[PDB]
Amino acid sequence: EEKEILWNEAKAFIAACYQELGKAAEVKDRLADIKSEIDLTGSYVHTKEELEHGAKMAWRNSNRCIGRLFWNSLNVIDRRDVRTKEEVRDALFHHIETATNNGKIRPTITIFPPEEKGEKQVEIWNHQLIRYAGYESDGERIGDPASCSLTAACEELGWRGERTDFDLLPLIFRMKGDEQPVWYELPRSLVIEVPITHPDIEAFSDLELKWYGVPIISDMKLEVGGIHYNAAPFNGWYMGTEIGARNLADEKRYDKLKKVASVIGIAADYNTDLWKDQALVELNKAVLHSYKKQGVSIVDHHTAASQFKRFEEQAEEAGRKLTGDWTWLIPPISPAATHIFHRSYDNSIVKPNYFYQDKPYE
Amino acid sequence: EEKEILWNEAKAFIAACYQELGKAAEVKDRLADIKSEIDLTGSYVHTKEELEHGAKMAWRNSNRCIGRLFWNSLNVIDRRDVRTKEEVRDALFHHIETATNNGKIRPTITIFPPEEKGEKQVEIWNHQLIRYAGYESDGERIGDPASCSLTAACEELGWRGERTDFDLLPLIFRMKGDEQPVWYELPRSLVIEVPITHPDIEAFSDLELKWYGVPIISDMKLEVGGIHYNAAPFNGWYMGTEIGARNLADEKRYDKLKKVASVIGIAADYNTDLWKDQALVELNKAVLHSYKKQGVSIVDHHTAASQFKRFEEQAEEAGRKLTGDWTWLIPPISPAATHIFHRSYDNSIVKPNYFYQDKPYE
Ligand code: HEM
Ligand code: HEM
Ligand SMILES: Nc1cccc(CCCCNCc2cccc(OCc3ccc4ccc(N)nc4c3)c2)n1
Ligand SMILES: Nc1cccc(CCCCNCc2cccc(OCc3ccc4ccc(N)nc4c3)c2)n1
Ligand SMILES: [Cl-]
Ligand SMILES: [Cl-]
C-alpha cells in the first residue's frame, strides 16, 4: 500500500520553506530525517515552524483571495494534539474568541491533526464556524437558503432552530471511529453580530438586517508538503461586498434588494432606472458604516484592491511569481474601478494551498 | 505559393451555412464549383447569401458580445464592388446614415472586398467610424486619451483638430497601391450626439458631457470560410455601461467620476463612502435617461443580460453549442446582479468570427 508521492511533495516544500526562513543549510538533514520517517511510518510530521509557514504560504498561493497582502501575519494555532470531541469543540470555541478579539479581528487558523491513511481524524461539517440556518418547507422560506442542506442534517440529529431569519447553526463535526457527528450550540457571548444601519437613511433599520462579525471558513483542506489537513478552519475580516453584494443581495440568498429600494425611496419597476445598482451601493455603504460604527474590522473593496496591488508589487520584489484568479479577484461592485479588472492573472495552482473537499453530508 | 488551407475552411463553412439555410442538397455542387475556382484563381467568391449569413454566424460566435440575441437580423451591406477612395468614403458615409436611422439604430455591417493575397484592398485606420480625438502635449490632456496615437497620425497627414474635448476624428483609410491613406472630415449632419443630463439632478448638465449615438467598430477582420474581410465595419446600439462605466469613467479615458461626485453632492474623500460606486450609478442612470429622452437606441445591462439568457436558451433549442467569454460578458456595473456572473462559459473560438488585426499606424 505504498506509492509514496508524499516524498516528492516533501522535497519541494521543505526546500522552499527553509529557503524563505533562511534555514537553507538545514535541508539535507531534515529531508533525510523525513525519508527514513516515511519508510518507517508511511508519513512524516511537520515542525512547529514548517506548519506555521506552510499555512502562510498556502494563503499566499490562494489565487481567489484579494486580501493576501497580510499573508505573513497569519496567526497559526497548532492543535494537532487534540484527541476528543470536547477538545475539538473547545479549540473551535477558542478560535472564535481569539479571532474576534473584541472586534479587532486577527487572521487566524487552527490546525487539527491531518489525514493519516487518507482517513480523517476530525471531520468538520460546518461551512463556516458561524453561519445562519436556512429553512424551506411548503412555500415558506426562512433564513439563509445556502444553509438548507446543513440545517436539515443538524435537525435530523436532534438540533432544532427557532426559525428566525438568523438562527446560529451549531458547531457540528465527526470524530474518527464514530458513525455520527456531534453538535454543540454556539454560546451567544462568543458571536459578535452587527445590525445594519445607514449613515443618512434612518429608515434603513426597518429592514432589521444583521450579519456576523467574523467569517471562519471551516470546510477547506490545507495541504502542506503532501500532508492533508482536512480540518483547518481559517478566518480573516470581511470585505464589505461579500455581505452587501452577495450574502444579503443574491436572489438565492437573503434577496433584499427590493426591500432596500423601498426604504431608500426609489422605485423598483424599470431596469433603466438602475434601481438594483443604486440599492446595491446604498446597502454596501450601510454594511461598512455599520461594522465601523460597532468597531468590528472590515475593509471596502477599493482599499482591498489597493492592498492587493501592493501584494503584487511585494511578490515581484521577492522574486516570486504571482498567481491569481481574475474571475474571483474582481469585486462584484464597480470591478472596473479597480486595477485588478484591467490586468490579467496566471491561474496556476502552487502548493501549499487550500482546496475544496466533498461535503460529508447530503 | 499554394498550401491552400482555404479549401478546408470552405468545406466546413459551406456545409454548415447551407445546412442552416435549408440548402443542404446544393452543397456538393457548390463545393465542386469552389474547388475548381480555388485551383484556377487561388481563391473563391462568396455568394450574396453565404456572405450575409456568414456575417450573421460571425456575430453569433463572438464570445465577448452580450447582445448576440439579435444575430439573425443583422443588416448586411455588400460593397465588394468598391474600387475607389470616393466609393469607400461614400459607403462609410452611407453606413453611418442607415445605421443611425434617425436614432432607431439598425445593427448593420458594410463588407468591403477581402484580402486577395493576404494583401488588403481597403485598410481602415479608424477604430470606430465615429470617435473623438485625443491630445496630450506638455501636461495638458484634451479629449479621449485612447485616440492619442490615431489623432497624432491624422495630424501628421494634414488634418487639424479644434482641440475641444469632443473633436470628431476624420475617416482615414488607405487603398491598395497607395503609400499613404486619405482622410475625410465627417459631416456634422451624419453624427448624432447625446448631451448627458440627469433625470433628478439638474446640475448634472454643468459637466457638459456628451457621447456619440452609434458605435461602429471598424478595425476588426471578419473571417468567413477562409476568406478574410479585413475591412468590414459593423455596429449595434450601445449598452449604457460602455459609456457611463468605461468611456467616461476610466482614469485612462475621460476620468469623470470625481466631477460626477461633486455635482451629485457627495464627498470624494473616503473609500468607505463608496463615492466612486455611487457616482458610477448616477452617471450610468444619466446616460440611459439621456439617450432615451433623445430617442437614440440604447440598452441597460440588466435588459441586455435578460436578452442574452434567451440567446443561451435559443442556442440550446437549435442544438448549437454556446460559447462565450465570461470575463467580457459580465457588465462592469453590478455583475453579480446578472445570471451571467453565476454560470460558466466555454471560451472556444468557432468560425465564422471577428478577429483583432494589427493597427496599420504607430
Ligand atoms: C484578512 C482578511 C481577508 C479578506 C478581506 C479576504 C478577502 C477574500 C475575498 C473577498 C475572497 C472571495 C470571496 C468570494 O467572492 O467568494 C477570498 C477568497 C479566499 N480567501 Fe481570502 N480574505 C482574507 C483572509 C484570508 C485568510 C486568512 C485566508 C486563509 C489563510 C484566506 C484564504 C482565502 C481562500 C482560500 C479563498 C477562496 C475560497 C474559495 O475558493 O471558495 N483569506 N478572500
Ligand atoms: C445590438 C447591439 C449590441 C450590443 C448592445 C452589444 C454589446 C456588446 C458589448 C457590451 C460588448 C463588450 C464591449 C466591451 O466591454 O469592450 C460587445 C462586444 C462585442 N460585440 Fe457586441 N453588441 C451589439 C451588437 C454587435 C454587432 C452587430 C456585432 C457584429 C456583428 C457585435 C460584435 C461584437 C464583438 C466582435 C465584440 C468583441 C469586440 C472585442 O473583442 O473587442 N456586436 N458587444
Ligand atoms: N473575508 C474572507 C476571509 C477569508 C475567506 C473569504 C472567502 C471564503 C468564501 C468561500 N466561498 C465558498 C464558495 C464556493 C463556491 C461558490 C461560491 O459562491 C460565491 C462566488 C464568488 C465568486 C464567483 C466568481 C465567479 C463565479 N462564476 N461564481 C462565483 C461565486 C462560494 N473571505
Ligand atoms: N454596443 C456595441 C456594439 C458592437 C460592439 C461593441 C463592443 C466593441 C468594443 C471593442 N473593444 C475594443 C477593446 C479591445 C481591447 C481592450 C478594450 O478595453 C475595454 C475592456 C473590456 C472588457 C475587459 C474585460 C477584461 C479585461 N481584463 N479588460 C477588459 C477591457 C477594448 N459594442
Ligand atoms: Cl460569507
Ligand atoms: Cl465605445
Side-chain angles (χ1 to χ4, degrees):
Chain A
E1 284 94 34
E2 60 181 64
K3 303 182 284 288
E4 298 164 353
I5 310 166
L6 176 79
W7 168 240
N8 293 334
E9 299 277 358
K11 287 185 296 179
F13 164 69
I14 301 292
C17 174
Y18 282 58
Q19 198 76 258
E20 304 180 13
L21 291 171
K23 288 175 162 93
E26 311 177 9
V27 169
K28 288 176 300 181
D29 288 341
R30 171 60 175 159
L31 306 168
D33 302 328
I34 282 178
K35 182 68 171 66
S36 309
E37 184 173 346
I38 292 182
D39 303 327
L40 319 182
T41 77
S43 176
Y44 78 99
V45 176
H46 283 124
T47 77
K48 61 186 182 295
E49 179 183 55
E50 301 162 353
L51 181 69
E52 167 179 349
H53 198 78
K56 292 180 179 181
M57 301 174 71
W59 186 9
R60 193 181 64 206
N61 294 325
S62 298
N63 284 359
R64 310 173 142 180
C65 181
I66 195 181
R68 279 184 280 165
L69 173 64
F70 313 105
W71 64 271
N72 198 54
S73 47
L74 178 70
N75 176 213
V76 185
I77 299 178
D78 179 7
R79 300 305 310 279
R80 289 171 293 165
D81 58 339
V82 69
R83 295 295 183 271
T84 66
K85 319 182 158 51
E86 307 202 285
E87 287 172 327
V88 172
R89 168 204 63 194
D90 291 350
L92 299 169
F93 282 170
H94 172 71
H95 189 125
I96 293 179
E97 180 174 63
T98 185
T100 295
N101 191 36
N102 286 120
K104 298 161 202 168
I105 295 171
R106 299 179 264 229
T108 307
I109 184 169
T110 302
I111 296 184
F112 291 111
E115 295 178 343
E116 174 187 358
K117 289 181 262 275
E119 175 195 21
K120 296 171 170 52
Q121 311 302 289
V122 166
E123 172 191 87
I124 302 182
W125 287 31
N126 309 88
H127 165 62
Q128 298 176 28
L129 296 191
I130 308 171
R131 214 178 199 202
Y132 298 135
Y135 315 90
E136 172 56 10
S137 71
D138 57 12
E140 201 196 27
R141 320 184 48 201
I142 296 171
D144 195 334
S147 295
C148 277
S149 49
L150 174 59
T151 303
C154 288
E155 286 200 320
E156 183 74 74
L157 296 167
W159 184 81
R160 173 81 176 190
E162 308 178 24
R163 266 144 184 87
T164 82
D165 275 334
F166 306 101
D167 294 353
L168 285 174
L169 279 167
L171 301 175
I172 172 161
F173 57 89
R174 192 185 55 75
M175 294 306 268
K176 175 187 60 179
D178 309 338
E179 287 167 30
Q180 294 293 61
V182 290
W183 58 264
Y184 303 94
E185 193 75 31
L186 273 173
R188 296 291 317 217
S189 62
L190 280 160
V191 177
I192 282 179
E193 294 176 297
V194 173
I196 307 299
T197 56
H198 194 273
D200 317 300
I201 306 161
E202 184 69 345
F204 208 92
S205 45
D206 305 346
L207 295 182
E208 300 200 272
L209 301 178
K210 68 178 183 178
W211 205 252
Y212 48 93
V214 189
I216 319 176
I217 303 297
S218 55
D219 58 3
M220 307 199 52
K221 162 183 294 181
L222 160 69
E223 181 179 338
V224 175
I227 303 293
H228 293 222
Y229 301 96
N230 66 284
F234 59 84
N235 74 278
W237 49 78
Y238 268 114
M239 181 155 90
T241 55
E242 291 174 283
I243 303 166
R246 302 300 313 278
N247 294 349
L248 297 174
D250 281 6
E251 289 189 314
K252 298 190 177 202
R253 301 295 295 289
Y254 279 75
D255 188 30
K256 295 287 182 170
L257 285 194
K258 256 190 189 65
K259 296 180 173 185
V260 167
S262 182
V263 299
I264 68 176
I266 65 171
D269 298 325
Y270 303 92
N271 283 356
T272 46
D273 289 340
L274 306 186
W275 64 265
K276 287 194 176 177
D277 302 307
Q278 190 164 341
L280 271 167
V281 159
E282 293 305 332
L283 176 56
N284 275 278
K285 287 166 57 182
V287 168
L288 301 161
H289 163 76
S290 298
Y291 273 66
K292 185 176 182 178
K293 161 157 62 171
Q294 184 145 331
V296 180
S297 290
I298 199 168
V299 64
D300 65 276
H301 54 286
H302 304 295
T303 306
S306 294
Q307 288 157 342
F308 182 68
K309 176 71 172 93
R310 292 161 56 210
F311 174 77
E312 297 174 33
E313 292 155 8
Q314 172 192 111
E316 173 81 346
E317 315 180 336
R320 281 186 306 264
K321 182 176 174 59
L322 171 74
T323 67
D325 191 335
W326 187 98
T327 70
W328 285 69
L329 289 169
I330 54 158
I333 300 297
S334 315
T338 72
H339 84 275
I340 298 174
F341 183 89
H342 304 287
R343 59 158 293 180
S344 57
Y345 296 90
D346 171 35
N347 199 19
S348 302
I349 293 154
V350 191
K351 295 185 179 185
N353 216 318
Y354 301 95
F355 298 91
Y356 290 163
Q357 56 190 346
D358 295 335
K359 300 297 282 182
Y361 59 87
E362 264 304 320
Chain B
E1 284 94 34
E2 60 181 64
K3 303 182 284 288
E4 298 164 353
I5 310 166
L6 176 79
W7 168 240
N8 293 334
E9 299 277 358
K11 287 185 296 179
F13 164 69
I14 301 292
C17 174
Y18 282 58
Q19 198 76 258
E20 304 180 13
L21 291 171
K23 288 175 162 93
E26 311 177 9
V27 169
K28 288 176 300 181
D29 288 341
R30 171 60 175 159
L31 306 168
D33 302 328
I34 282 178
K35 182 68 171 66
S36 309
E37 184 173 346
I38 292 182
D39 303 327
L40 319 182
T41 77
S43 176
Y44 78 99
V45 176
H46 283 124
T47 77
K48 61 186 182 295
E49 179 183 55
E50 301 162 353
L51 181 69
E52 167 179 349
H53 198 78
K56 292 180 179 181
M57 301 174 71
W59 186 9
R60 193 181 64 206
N61 294 325
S62 298
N63 284 359
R64 310 173 142 180
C65 181
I66 195 181
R68 279 184 280 165
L69 173 64
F70 313 105
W71 64 271
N72 198 54
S73 47
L74 178 70
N75 176 213
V76 185
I77 299 178
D78 179 7
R79 300 305 310 279
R80 289 171 293 165
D81 58 339
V82 69
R83 295 295 183 271
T84 66
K85 319 182 158 51
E86 307 202 285
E87 287 172 327
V88 172
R89 168 204 63 194
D90 291 350
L92 299 169
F93 282 170
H94 172 71
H95 189 125
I96 293 179
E97 180 174 63
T98 185
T100 295
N101 191 36
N102 286 120
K104 298 161 202 168
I105 295 171
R106 299 179 264 229
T108 307
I109 184 169
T110 302
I111 296 184
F112 291 111
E115 295 178 343
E116 174 187 358
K117 289 181 262 275
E119 175 195 21
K120 296 171 170 52
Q121 311 302 289
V122 166
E123 172 191 87
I124 302 182
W125 287 31
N126 309 88
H127 165 62
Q128 298 176 28
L129 296 191
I130 308 171
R131 214 178 199 202
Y132 298 135
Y135 315 90
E136 172 56 10
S137 71
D138 57 12
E140 201 196 27
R141 320 184 48 201
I142 296 171
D144 195 334
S147 295
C148 277
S149 49
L150 174 59
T151 303
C154 288
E155 286 200 320
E156 183 74 74
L157 296 167
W159 184 81
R160 173 81 176 190
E162 308 178 24
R163 266 144 184 87
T164 82
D165 275 334
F166 306 101
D167 294 353
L168 285 174
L169 279 167
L171 301 175
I172 172 161
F173 57 89
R174 192 185 55 75
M175 294 306 268
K176 175 187 60 179
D178 309 338
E179 287 167 30
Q180 294 293 61
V182 290
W183 58 264
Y184 303 94
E185 193 75 31
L186 273 173
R188 296 291 317 217
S189 62
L190 280 160
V191 177
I192 282 179
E193 294 176 297
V194 173
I196 307 299
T197 56
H198 194 273
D200 317 300
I201 306 161
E202 184 69 345
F204 208 92
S205 45
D206 305 346
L207 295 182
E208 300 200 272
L209 301 178
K210 68 178 183 178
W211 205 252
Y212 48 93
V214 189
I216 319 176
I217 303 297
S218 55
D219 58 3
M220 307 199 52
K221 162 183 294 181
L222 160 69
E223 181 179 338
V224 175
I227 303 293
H228 293 222
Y229 301 96
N230 66 284
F234 59 84
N235 74 278
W237 49 78
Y238 268 114
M239 181 155 90
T241 55
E242 291 174 283
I243 303 166
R246 302 300 313 278
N247 294 349
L248 297 174
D250 281 6
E251 289 189 314
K252 298 190 177 202
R253 301 295 295 289
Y254 279 75
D255 188 30
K256 295 287 182 170
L257 285 194
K258 256 190 189 65
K259 296 180 173 185
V260 167
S262 182
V263 299
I264 68 176
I266 65 171
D269 298 325
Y270 303 92
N271 283 356
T272 46
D273 289 340
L274 306 186
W275 64 265
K276 287 194 176 177
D277 302 307
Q278 190 164 341
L280 271 167
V281 159
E282 293 305 332
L283 176 56
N284 275 278
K285 287 166 57 182
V287 168
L288 301 161
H289 163 76
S290 298
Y291 273 66
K292 185 176 182 178
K293 161 157 62 171
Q294 184 145 331
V296 180
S297 290
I298 199 168
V299 64
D300 65 276
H301 54 286
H302 304 295
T303 306
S306 294
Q307 288 157 342
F308 182 68
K309 176 71 172 93
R310 292 161 56 210
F311 174 77
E312 297 174 33
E313 292 155 8
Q314 172 192 111
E316 173 81 346
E317 315 180 336
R320 281 186 306 264
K321 182 176 174 59
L322 171 74
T323 67
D325 191 335
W326 187 98
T327 70
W328 285 69
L329 289 169
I330 54 158
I333 300 297
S334 315
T338 72
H339 84 275
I340 298 174
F341 183 89
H342 304 287
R343 59 158 293 180
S344 57
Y345 296 90
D346 171 35
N347 199 19
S348 302
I349 293 154
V350 191
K351 295 185 179 185
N353 216 318
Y354 301 95
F355 298 91
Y356 290 163
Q357 56 190 346
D358 295 335
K359 300 297 282 182
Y361 59 87
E362 264 304 320

Short mmCIF file of all heavy atoms in Angstrom, two decimals, chain B residues 59 62 64-67 74 107 220 234-239 242 299 328 354 356, ligand 2:
data_model
loop_
_atom_site.label_atom_id
_atom_site.label_comp_id
_atom_site.label_asym_id
_atom_site.label_seq_id
_atom_site.Cartn_x
_atom_site.Cartn_y
_atom_site.Cartn_z
N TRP B 59 -21.25 37.09 -35.91
CA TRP B 59 -21.79 37.75 -34.73
C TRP B 59 -22.23 36.73 -33.69
O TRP B 59 -21.97 36.89 -32.50
CB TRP B 59 -22.94 38.67 -35.13
CG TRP B 59 -23.50 39.54 -34.01
CD1 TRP B 59 -22.98 39.72 -32.76
CD2 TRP B 59 -24.69 40.34 -34.07
NE1 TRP B 59 -23.77 40.58 -32.03
CE2 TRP B 59 -24.83 40.97 -32.81
CE3 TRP B 59 -25.65 40.58 -35.05
CZ2 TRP B 59 -25.89 41.83 -32.52
CZ3 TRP B 59 -26.70 41.43 -34.76
CH2 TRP B 59 -26.81 42.04 -33.51
N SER B 62 -19.33 35.44 -31.52
CA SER B 62 -18.48 36.41 -30.83
C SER B 62 -18.62 36.20 -29.33
O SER B 62 -19.58 36.66 -28.70
CB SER B 62 -18.87 37.83 -31.23
OG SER B 62 -18.67 38.03 -32.62
N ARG B 64 -17.41 37.43 -26.73
CA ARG B 64 -17.41 38.56 -25.82
C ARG B 64 -18.65 39.45 -25.94
O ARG B 64 -18.76 40.43 -25.19
CB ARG B 64 -16.15 39.40 -26.02
CG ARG B 64 -14.87 38.57 -26.01
CD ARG B 64 -13.65 39.40 -26.39
NE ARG B 64 -12.49 39.02 -25.61
CZ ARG B 64 -11.28 39.57 -25.73
NH1 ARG B 64 -11.09 40.54 -26.61
NH2 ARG B 64 -10.28 39.16 -24.97
N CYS B 65 -19.58 39.14 -26.85
CA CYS B 65 -20.71 40.01 -27.12
C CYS B 65 -21.95 39.54 -26.36
O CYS B 65 -22.40 38.40 -26.54
CB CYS B 65 -21.01 40.08 -28.62
SG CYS B 65 -22.39 41.17 -29.02
N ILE B 66 -22.50 40.43 -25.54
CA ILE B 66 -23.71 40.14 -24.77
C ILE B 66 -24.98 40.36 -25.58
O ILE B 66 -26.05 39.87 -25.18
CB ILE B 66 -23.72 41.00 -23.50
CG1 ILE B 66 -24.73 40.49 -22.48
CG2 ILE B 66 -23.98 42.46 -23.85
CD1 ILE B 66 -24.78 41.32 -21.21
N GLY B 67 -24.91 41.06 -26.70
CA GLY B 67 -26.11 41.40 -27.44
C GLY B 67 -26.41 40.45 -28.59
O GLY B 67 -27.16 40.80 -29.50
N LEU B 74 -29.13 41.05 -38.39
CA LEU B 74 -28.07 41.94 -38.84
C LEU B 74 -28.31 42.37 -40.29
O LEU B 74 -28.60 41.54 -41.15
CB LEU B 74 -26.72 41.23 -38.71
CG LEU B 74 -25.46 41.97 -39.18
CD1 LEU B 74 -25.12 43.15 -38.27
CD2 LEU B 74 -24.28 41.01 -39.27
N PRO B 107 -28.63 47.37 -36.34
CA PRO B 107 -27.37 46.61 -36.44
C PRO B 107 -27.03 46.33 -37.89
O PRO B 107 -27.76 45.63 -38.59
CB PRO B 107 -27.67 45.33 -35.65
CG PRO B 107 -28.74 45.73 -34.69
CD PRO B 107 -29.59 46.72 -35.44
N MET B 220 -11.78 45.52 -37.11
CA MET B 220 -11.76 44.08 -36.92
C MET B 220 -11.93 43.36 -38.25
O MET B 220 -12.61 43.85 -39.16
CB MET B 220 -12.86 43.63 -35.94
CG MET B 220 -12.84 44.38 -34.61
SD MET B 220 -13.73 43.57 -33.26
CE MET B 220 -13.02 41.92 -33.30
N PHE B 234 -18.85 47.19 -38.50
CA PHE B 234 -20.16 46.79 -38.01
C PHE B 234 -20.56 47.68 -36.84
O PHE B 234 -19.72 48.35 -36.23
CB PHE B 234 -20.17 45.31 -37.57
CG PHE B 234 -19.17 44.98 -36.49
CD1 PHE B 234 -19.48 45.19 -35.15
CD2 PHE B 234 -17.93 44.45 -36.81
CE1 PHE B 234 -18.57 44.88 -34.15
CE2 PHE B 234 -17.01 44.14 -35.82
CZ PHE B 234 -17.33 44.36 -34.49
N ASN B 235 -21.85 47.67 -36.53
CA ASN B 235 -22.37 48.47 -35.44
C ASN B 235 -23.56 47.77 -34.81
O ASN B 235 -24.27 47.00 -35.46
CB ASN B 235 -22.79 49.87 -35.90
CG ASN B 235 -24.09 49.85 -36.69
OD1 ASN B 235 -24.09 49.57 -37.89
ND2 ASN B 235 -25.20 50.14 -36.02
N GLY B 236 -23.77 48.05 -33.53
CA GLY B 236 -25.03 47.79 -32.87
C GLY B 236 -25.49 49.08 -32.22
O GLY B 236 -25.12 50.16 -32.68
N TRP B 237 -26.28 48.98 -31.17
CA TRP B 237 -26.51 50.11 -30.29
C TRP B 237 -25.68 49.93 -29.03
O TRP B 237 -25.20 48.84 -28.72
CB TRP B 237 -27.99 50.24 -29.93
CG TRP B 237 -28.61 48.96 -29.46
CD1 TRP B 237 -28.48 48.39 -28.23
CD2 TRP B 237 -29.45 48.09 -30.22
NE1 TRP B 237 -29.19 47.21 -28.18
CE2 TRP B 237 -29.79 47.00 -29.39
CE3 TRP B 237 -29.95 48.12 -31.53
CZ2 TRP B 237 -30.61 45.96 -29.82
CZ3 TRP B 237 -30.76 47.08 -31.96
CH2 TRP B 237 -31.08 46.02 -31.10
N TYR B 238 -25.49 51.03 -28.30
CA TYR B 238 -24.71 50.96 -27.07
C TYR B 238 -25.46 50.26 -25.95
O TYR B 238 -26.68 50.37 -25.81
CB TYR B 238 -24.31 52.35 -26.58
CG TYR B 238 -22.97 52.84 -27.07
CD1 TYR B 238 -22.87 53.92 -27.93
CD2 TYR B 238 -21.79 52.26 -26.61
CE1 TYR B 238 -21.63 54.39 -28.35
CE2 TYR B 238 -20.56 52.70 -27.02
CZ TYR B 238 -20.48 53.77 -27.89
OH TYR B 238 -19.24 54.21 -28.29
N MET B 239 -24.70 49.53 -25.14
CA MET B 239 -25.10 49.21 -23.78
C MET B 239 -24.61 50.35 -22.89
O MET B 239 -23.49 50.84 -23.06
CB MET B 239 -24.50 47.88 -23.32
CG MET B 239 -24.88 47.48 -21.91
SD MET B 239 -24.79 45.69 -21.69
CE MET B 239 -23.09 45.51 -21.15
N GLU B 242 -21.10 50.79 -21.27
CA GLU B 242 -19.95 51.07 -22.13
C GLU B 242 -19.59 52.55 -22.08
O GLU B 242 -18.40 52.91 -22.09
CB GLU B 242 -20.24 50.64 -23.56
CG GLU B 242 -20.33 49.14 -23.76
CD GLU B 242 -20.76 48.76 -25.17
OE1 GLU B 242 -21.96 48.87 -25.48
OE2 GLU B 242 -19.88 48.35 -25.96
N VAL B 299 -29.51 50.22 -24.53
CA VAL B 299 -30.00 49.14 -23.67
C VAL B 299 -29.20 49.16 -22.37
O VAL B 299 -28.00 49.44 -22.36
CB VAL B 299 -29.89 47.76 -24.37
CG1 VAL B 299 -28.44 47.40 -24.65
CG2 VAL B 299 -30.57 46.68 -23.54
N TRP B 328 -15.67 39.00 -20.33
CA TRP B 328 -16.19 40.10 -21.12
C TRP B 328 -17.71 40.18 -21.13
O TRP B 328 -18.25 41.26 -21.38
CB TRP B 328 -15.69 40.00 -22.57
CG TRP B 328 -14.25 40.40 -22.73
CD1 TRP B 328 -13.16 39.72 -22.26
CD2 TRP B 328 -13.75 41.55 -23.42
NE1 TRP B 328 -12.01 40.39 -22.60
CE2 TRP B 328 -12.34 41.51 -23.32
CE3 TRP B 328 -14.35 42.61 -24.11
CZ2 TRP B 328 -11.53 42.49 -23.88
CZ3 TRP B 328 -13.54 43.58 -24.67
CH2 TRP B 328 -12.14 43.52 -24.55
N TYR B 354 -15.22 37.39 -35.77
CA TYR B 354 -14.49 38.64 -35.91
C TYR B 354 -13.22 38.57 -35.07
O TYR B 354 -13.24 38.07 -33.94
CB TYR B 354 -15.36 39.83 -35.48
CG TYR B 354 -16.63 39.96 -36.29
CD1 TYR B 354 -17.82 39.41 -35.84
CD2 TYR B 354 -16.63 40.62 -37.51
CE1 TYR B 354 -18.99 39.53 -36.58
CE2 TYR B 354 -17.78 40.74 -38.26
CZ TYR B 354 -18.96 40.19 -37.79
OH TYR B 354 -20.11 40.30 -38.54
N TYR B 356 -9.21 40.41 -34.01
CA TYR B 356 -8.29 41.54 -33.98
C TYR B 356 -7.31 41.45 -35.15
O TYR B 356 -7.04 40.38 -35.69
CB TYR B 356 -7.51 41.57 -32.67
CG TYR B 356 -8.32 41.94 -31.44
CD1 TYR B 356 -7.84 41.67 -30.17
CD2 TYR B 356 -9.56 42.56 -31.56
CE1 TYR B 356 -8.57 42.01 -29.04
CE2 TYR B 356 -10.30 42.90 -30.44
CZ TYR B 356 -9.80 42.62 -29.18
OH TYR B 356 -10.53 42.96 -28.07
C1 HEM C 2 -27.11 45.28 -30.98
C2 HEM C 2 -26.39 45.94 -30.08
C3 HEM C 2 -25.16 45.37 -29.46
C4 HEM C 2 -24.83 45.46 -28.14
C5 HEM C 2 -25.63 46.14 -27.07
C6 HEM C 2 -23.58 44.79 -27.98
C7 HEM C 2 -22.96 44.70 -26.73
C8 HEM C 2 -21.63 44.37 -26.65
C9 HEM C 2 -20.80 44.70 -25.56
C10 HEM C 2 -21.23 45.43 -24.31
C11 HEM C 2 -19.56 44.24 -25.83
C12 HEM C 2 -18.35 44.35 -24.93
C13 HEM C 2 -17.69 45.72 -25.06
C14 HEM C 2 -16.53 45.85 -24.10
O1 HEM C 2 -16.69 45.64 -22.88
O2 HEM C 2 -15.40 46.19 -24.53
C15 HEM C 2 -19.61 43.62 -27.10
C16 HEM C 2 -18.51 43.05 -27.67
C17 HEM C 2 -18.55 42.67 -28.99
N1 HEM C 2 -19.60 42.70 -29.84
FE1 HEM C 2 -21.37 43.22 -29.50
N2 HEM C 2 -23.14 44.33 -29.15
C18 HEM C 2 -24.06 44.61 -30.10
C19 HEM C 2 -24.04 44.32 -31.47
C20 HEM C 2 -22.99 43.70 -32.12
C21 HEM C 2 -22.86 43.51 -33.51
C22 HEM C 2 -23.87 43.96 -34.54
C23 HEM C 2 -21.67 42.84 -33.73
C24 HEM C 2 -21.09 42.42 -35.03
C25 HEM C 2 -21.79 41.78 -35.96
C26 HEM C 2 -21.07 42.63 -32.45
C27 HEM C 2 -19.86 42.02 -32.21
C28 HEM C 2 -19.16 42.20 -31.01
C29 HEM C 2 -17.74 41.86 -30.92
C30 HEM C 2 -16.88 41.30 -32.03
C31 HEM C 2 -17.35 42.15 -29.67
C32 HEM C 2 -15.97 41.98 -29.07
C33 HEM C 2 -15.01 43.06 -29.58
C34 HEM C 2 -13.65 42.92 -28.92
O3 HEM C 2 -13.13 41.80 -28.76
O4 HEM C 2 -13.04 43.95 -28.55
N3 HEM C 2 -21.91 43.14 -31.51
N4 HEM C 2 -20.90 43.70 -27.61
#
